[PDB]
Amino acid sequence: PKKRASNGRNKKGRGHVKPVRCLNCARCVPKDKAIKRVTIRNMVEAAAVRDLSEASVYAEYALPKLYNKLHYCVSCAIHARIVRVRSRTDRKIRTPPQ
Amino acid sequence: TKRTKKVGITGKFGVRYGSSLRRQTKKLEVQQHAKYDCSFCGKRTVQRGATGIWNCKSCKKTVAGGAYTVSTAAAATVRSTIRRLRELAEA
Amino acid sequence: MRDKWRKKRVRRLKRKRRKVRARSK
Amino acid sequence: VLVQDLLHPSPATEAKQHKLKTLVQQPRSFFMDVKCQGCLNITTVFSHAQTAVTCDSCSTVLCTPTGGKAKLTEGCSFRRK
Amino acid sequence: VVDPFTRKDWFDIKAPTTFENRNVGKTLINRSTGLKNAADGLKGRVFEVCLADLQGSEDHSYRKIKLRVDEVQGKNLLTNFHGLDFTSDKLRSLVRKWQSLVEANVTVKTSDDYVLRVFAIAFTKRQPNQIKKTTYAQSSKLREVRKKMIEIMQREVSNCTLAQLTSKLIPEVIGREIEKSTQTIFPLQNVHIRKVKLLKQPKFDLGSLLALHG
Amino acid sequence: NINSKLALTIKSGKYTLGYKSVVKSLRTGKAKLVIIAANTPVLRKSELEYYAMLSKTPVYYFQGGNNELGTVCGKLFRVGTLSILDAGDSDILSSI
Amino acid sequence: PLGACPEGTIVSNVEEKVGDRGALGRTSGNYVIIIGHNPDENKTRVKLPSGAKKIISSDARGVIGVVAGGGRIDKPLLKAGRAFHKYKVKRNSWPKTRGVAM
Amino acid sequence: SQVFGVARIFASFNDTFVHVTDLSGKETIARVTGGMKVKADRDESSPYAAMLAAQDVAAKCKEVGITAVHIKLRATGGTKTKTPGPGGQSALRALARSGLRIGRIEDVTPVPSXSTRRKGGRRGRRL
RNA sequence: CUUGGAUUUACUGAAGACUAACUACUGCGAAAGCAUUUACCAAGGACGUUUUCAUUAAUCAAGAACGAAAGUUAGGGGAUCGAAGAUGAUCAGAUACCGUCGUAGUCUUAACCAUAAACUAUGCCGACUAGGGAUCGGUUGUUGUUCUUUUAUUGACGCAAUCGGCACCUUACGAGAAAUCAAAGUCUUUGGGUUCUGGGGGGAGUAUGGUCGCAAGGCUGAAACUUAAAGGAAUUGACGGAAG
Ligand SMILES: CN[C@@H]1[C@@H](O)[C@@H](O[C@@H]2[C@@H](O)[C@H](O[C@H]3O[C@H]([C@@H](C)O)[C@@H](O)[C@H](O)[C@H]3N)[C@@H](N)C[C@H]2N)OC[C@]1(C)O
Ligand SMILES: [Zn+2]
Numbered sequence A: 001p002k003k004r005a006s007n008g009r010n011k012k013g014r015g016h017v018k019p020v021r022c023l024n025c026a027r028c029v030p031k032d033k034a035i036k037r038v039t040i041r042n043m044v045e046a047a048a049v050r051d052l053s054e055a056s057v058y059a060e061y062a063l064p065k066l067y068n069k070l071h072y073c074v075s076c077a078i079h080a081r082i083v084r085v086r087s088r089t090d091r092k093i094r095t096p097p098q
Numbered sequence B: 001t002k003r004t005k006k007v008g009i010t011g012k013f014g015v016r017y018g019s020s021l022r023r024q025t026k027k028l029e030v031q032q033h034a035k036y037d038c039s040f041c042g043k044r045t046v047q048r049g050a051t052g053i054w055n056c057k058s059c060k061k062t063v064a065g066g067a068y069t070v071s072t073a074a075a076a077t078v079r080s081t082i083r084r085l086r087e088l089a090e091a
Numbered sequence C: 001m002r003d004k005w006r007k008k009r010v011r012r013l014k015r016k017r018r019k020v021r022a023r024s025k
Numbered sequence D: 001v002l003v004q005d006l007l008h009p010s011p012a013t014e015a016k017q018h019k020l021k022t023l024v025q026q027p028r029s030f031f032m033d034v035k036c037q038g039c040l041n042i043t044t045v046f047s048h049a050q051t052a053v054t055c056d057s058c059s060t061v062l063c064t065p066t067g068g069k070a071k072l073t074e075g076c077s078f079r080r081k
Numbered sequence E: 001v002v003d004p005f006t007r008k009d010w011f012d013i014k015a016p017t018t019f020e021n022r023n024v025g026k027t028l029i030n031r032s033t034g035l036k037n038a039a040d041g042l043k044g045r046v047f048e049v050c051l052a053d054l055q056g057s058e059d060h061s062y063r064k065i066k067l068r069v070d071e072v073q074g075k076n077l078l079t080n081f082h083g084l085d086f087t088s089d090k091l092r093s094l095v096r097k098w099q100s101l102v103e104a105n106v107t108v109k110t111s112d113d114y115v116l117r118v119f120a121i122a123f124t125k126r127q128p129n130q131i132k133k134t135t136y137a138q139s140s141k142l143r144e145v146r147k148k149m150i151e152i153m154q155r156e157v158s159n160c161t162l163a164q165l166t167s168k169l170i171p172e173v174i175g176r177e178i179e180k181s182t183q184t185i186f187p188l189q190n191v192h193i194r195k196v197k198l199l200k201q202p203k204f205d206l207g208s209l210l211a212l213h214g
Numbered sequence F: 001n002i003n004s005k006l007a008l009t010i011k012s013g014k015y016t017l018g019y020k021s022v023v024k025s026l027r028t029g030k031a032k033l034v035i036i037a038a039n040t041p042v043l044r045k046s047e048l049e050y051y052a053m054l055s056k057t058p059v060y061y062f063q064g065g066n067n068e069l070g071t072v073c074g075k076l077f078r079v080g081t082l083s084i085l086d087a088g089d090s091d092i093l094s095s096i
Numbered sequence G: 001p002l003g004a005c006p007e008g009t010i011v012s013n014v015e016e017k018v019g020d021r022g023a024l025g026r027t028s029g030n031y032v033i034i035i036g037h038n039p040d041e042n043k044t045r046v047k048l049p050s051g052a053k054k055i056i057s058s059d060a061r062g063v064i065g066v067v068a069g070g071g072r073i074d075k076p077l078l079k080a081g082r083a084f085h086k087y088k089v090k091r092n093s094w095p096k097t098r099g100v101a102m
Numbered sequence H: 001s002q003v004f005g006v007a008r009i010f011a012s013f014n015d016t017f018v019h020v021t022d023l024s025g026k027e028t029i030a031r032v033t034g035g036m037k038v039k040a041d042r043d044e045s046s047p048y049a050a051m052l053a054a055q056d057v058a059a060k061c062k063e064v065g066i067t068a069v070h071i072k073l074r075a076t077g078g079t080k081t082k083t084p085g086p087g088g089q090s091a092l093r094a095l096a097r098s099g100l101r102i103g104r105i106e107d108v109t110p111v112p113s114x115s116t117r118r119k120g121g122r123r124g125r126r127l
Numbered sequence I: 001c002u003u004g005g006a007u008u009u010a011c012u013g014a015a016g017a018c019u020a021a022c023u024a025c026u027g028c029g030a031a032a033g034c035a036u037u038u039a040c041c042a043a044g045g046a047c048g049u050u051u052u053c054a055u056u057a058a059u060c061a062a063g064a065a066c067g068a069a070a071g072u073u074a075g076g077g078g079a080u081c082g083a084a085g086a087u088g089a090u091c092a093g094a095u096a097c098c099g100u101c102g103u104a105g106u107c108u109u110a111a112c113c114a115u116a117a118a119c120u121a122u123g124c125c126g127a128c129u130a131g132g133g134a135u136c137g138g139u140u141g142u143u144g145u146u147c148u149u150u151u152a153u154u155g156a157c158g159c160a161a162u163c164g165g166c167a168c169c170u171u172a173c174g175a176g177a178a179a180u181c182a183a184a185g186u187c188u189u190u191g192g193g194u195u196c197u198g199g200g201g202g203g204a205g206u207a208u209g210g211u212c213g214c215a216a217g218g219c220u221g222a223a224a225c226u227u228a229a230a231g232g233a234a235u236u237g238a239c240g241g242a243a244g
């Protein structure tokens, strides 16, 4: 049968899309299909925030922010719980969780 | 009528030397014996005398060229490269 | 049998059958 | 709606639609009398002007073409005819 | 078996007078033995310092200034401008989805024969009353913006020497100029000269160099 | 847009074709414009512009060779040079 | 002189020593590439047709361009007779008997 | 006042580097890795090993005459992953808990502007 | 691989590739495909038009253009990955997965090859049938907004109409074996025009003849014989080195 009306990707209006390599296994995967995450995290772990504040020379000096965008192939995304198998009526939800 | 299907000018070699060797010769011999446009008088009267020598029967000017064509790709690139480096130096 | 390899088996077979043919015009 | 007036639709709607889509097609462009403020001469100019229509011996350019209706130059006035 | 840190001559780093503070930091090298001078030595070494430290204001925390030594006065080593760059975190903070990134670069030579490559950067800005979900500028508008970037950097950068150039970069007047003379094309934000390359240097003149560490 | 301006001059104006005709039109003073193809020999091109200087005639240097200049005049033969004798409904004289 | 040619200039019939009237890049289709300059030492670095890199005096001369007649070897000789005519004006080095046949 | 070095930390999932240089980066002060702290090959990225390596580097930079360090942080970079390995955070915390004054922390992971091809193939490493 | 200092740090340089981040239920193209700047070349859809011709049209055997990747020939390049090969592990064995190299290849130029789950597994042209909110391009009317200037013939943005698109959401008119479908509807109340294809499963896209290709192969394409099911969608259960 046909599981999804979008065929598990986002490619209605064109023929081909360049691939990207998976973060974990380096699998070529279409960009429109790759599961993609934008992560902002603090460059210093929280339990060392005050220790670095003590040890810093400066006063009122901001903490640099780590930026990266993560691409996963479906296997490496399910095996990392980044997405999880959902029910037939719940697969049809594009709105992010809360 | 079309006298030969594919051998063309290399029909003078008959069945000898192998088809790949005759086909490689055909590519360069057509260029070797072709008429080219003169860059001086603008007529199609440039023919090869010997390798690297190209004469115009109209204006009687001889230009040094390639073995089998009037101009080679490397020489064309040099003219642009020498053109470019000329103004970048004189400015 | 993964029909892909079934076709590949026939290709190699048909390649060899064409060798035996050319042996005797 | 099951029962409707196809013959006498709302003129606001009939003006809301597309030129070919009304009960009978009718162009929604017009002809306008272009008159620069400098002179009193009158020139007839199509509202959608593909060419830059000039005026008489006064030597003025009246409109400049666009993708739709050509806007009048600075200091020209028009009247729908 | 020998301790290499006992053969170390700790020189000191001196910035140009164009910056607020020229007390950058320390350095160390093997001393000037008969078979190894400490004069040739030090020369060339490149230092990457934060412009906040050089101007004493965290408004400059992201630009990193590259300074490389070109003469040593005893224990003082004098540097000259060697390039500009943002830090990675700032540039990764600026690049945001649902907007139009636009760049531009140009090769330009100073008044005193310093050939540079200058990189601009800007972004499209969402209007105060904007309701549509994205802020995208049309492609020809971006061509216009990039053209203006290139022309303005060319004219504003080739008309002042390298020292005047580095004095001109700190307030970021080229950036605000790109800001001002594009608002009739498309509103822009976060306009910057994010990177400057020192490609070719002219023949070295101490009389011009000393004029910068007076 | 010179190829357009010269194309109209051929269509409506007056002209003469070839090196010998041009020189005669320079001697009689009837030439209004002399046009020289790019691959015309310099000795002939310098000869033409010396005639043009004596007779107070402007010279236009055509970008292409005689194959191109002949085609631009709507002809099937090469034109190394030509002179305009009467511009016709064209402003090639003022536009160059 | 090679010192007057910027990086990447294609040059032929290049002198090895100043004033020897040409030694390098002389056959059809061959040339010498100028790689870089060492103005303080008056030396130029060039790329020879074989692939070797060589430092030459910047006062050594060369001729701008590529030696004409390039592409001879692209066409096969096809015949012993063409080789006969080729070496008939070069030297007596053809035909070649194999050492194992002796 | 404070004398500044450059503590360049290379953290990867195979080993962690804590290695201090002068402000130009030309002169090496110390270079300690988790492979000098653990006997086993698997443990070289363990945060404990990185912390010990960072303390050793602290002692060396102190006996050299270095009081403060600017932190330079990077992952493996290039075609590899962009997140720094486990030892980097622990090494950074150790350096800020040894009496060393901490300058400006930054991440300089080598990021390609689209580059060569990663190893593995198009199906990738298959486990 | 490393005390011949490997790895790691800074500067300069040399190569070939690639075009990140922006980048999306967004754009263009007949399809395959197409993503750095700029300039030139010719081309194109849509829109606007009170411009022009007047049936010039639709679909199409035969016959033609283009056609990812891999592959072929000859030059040039050959950084990186890397079929084959060599080699270390795991293993009962692994000439596999995993690790280290690494030949073709990957790139380009001039020619071949003509196939993909080349997919929307949905021929093309035309008409009609139900509601909604977005988005791209063009055009048409319009502000408590931001920008030029504070003011115009600014630009962006905001609010209503339309034409064209890529799509999406709800319902089930109606359809369907169902999954599902605004077309897969207007089909036993069976007929708008037209091209191609299928007729139980295998044997078999095989053999043979023809034909194209340098080859690899492509296109066209049977029969004997064999067999009671093969298959589609959904249900309940059981099971999973699947999740909670
Ligand atoms: C050496 N390559 C071989 C190739 O020769 C071929 O092998 C066939 C094999 O398929 C045939 O096998 C055949 O016959 C057997 C047998 C029980 O009757 C049946 O399973 C069935 O009819 C058929 N598979 C066998 N009879 C001959 C081999 N040469 O196919 C397998 C292969 C590995 O490609
Ligand atoms: Zn993966």
Ligand SMILES: [Zn+2]
Pocket (backbone or CB within 6 Å): B038, B039, B040, B041, B042, B043, B045, B056, B057, B058, B059, B060, B061
């Ligand atoms: Zn000639």
